[PDB]
């Protein structure tokens, strides 16, 4: 799959440049590294794409309280590809030591236990993110 093309086709919130919209849609550029640096961060990113997200969160010191839908209609390889895009397009992976590209088997394993958006929030909190 081509992660850049998949991303294009769903970039209307986080923007083609991944910088988001202040207060509305959080940034991905420069923030993916922050999540990947946490134990369980790569699994969390997969869960957001499979199952969506809701709840109050903080990103780069700004509060968000929005909703994101599931993208489970994407295949395992397509979720892996768009995560590799957001991890590399704006240099985020260059900040975390030992990063390896996302793989279809990681997504397959997590698709096997369905979560609600509210449970995805609980997983974010388990990472130590506010």
Contact 123, 40 (CB under 8 A): yes
31 is in an annotated binding site: no
Q: Which CATH number fits domain 1-130: 1.10.760.10, 3.40.50.300, 3.40.50.20, 3.80.10.10?
A: 1.10.760.10
**Domain regions of the chain by residue span:** 1-130
The CA distance from 130 to 114, in Å, is 24
Could you tell me the resolution of this structure in angstroms?
1.4
Q: How far is CA 45 from the centre of its chain?
A: 4
Rg (the chain; Cα; Å): 13
The region, left, alpha or beta by phi > 0 then psi within -120 to 50, assigned to residue 57 is: beta
10 is in an annotated binding site: yes
Two tokens at 68? 């994101």
Secondary structure of the chain: what % helix, strand, coil (to 5)?
Answer: 45, 10, 45
Task: For residue 127, give Cα distances in angstroms to 9, 11, 22, 39, 45.
Answer: 29, 25, 23, 7, 11
14 is in an annotated binding site: yes
The CA distance from 18 to 89, in Å, is 9
62 is in an annotated binding site: no
């Amino acid at each position: 799959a081509d992660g850049a093309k998949i991303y294009a086709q769903c970039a209307g919130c986080h923007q083609q440049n991944g910088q988001g919209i202040p207060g509305a849609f959080p940034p991905l550029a420069g923030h993916v590294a922050e999540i990947l640096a946490k134990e369980g961060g790569r699994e969390y990113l997969i869960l957001v794409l499979l199952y969506g997200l809701q709840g109050q969160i903080e990103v780069k010191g700004m509060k968000y309280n929005g909703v994101m839908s599931s993208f489970a209609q994407l295949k395992d390889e397509e979720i892996a590809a768009v995560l590799n895009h957001i991890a590399t397009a704006w240099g985020d992976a260059k900040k975390v030591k030992g990063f390896k590209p996302f793989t279809a088997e990681e997504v397959k394993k997590l698709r096997a236990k369905k979560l609600t958006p509210q449970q995805v929030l609980a997983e974010r909190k388990k990472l130590g993110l506010k």
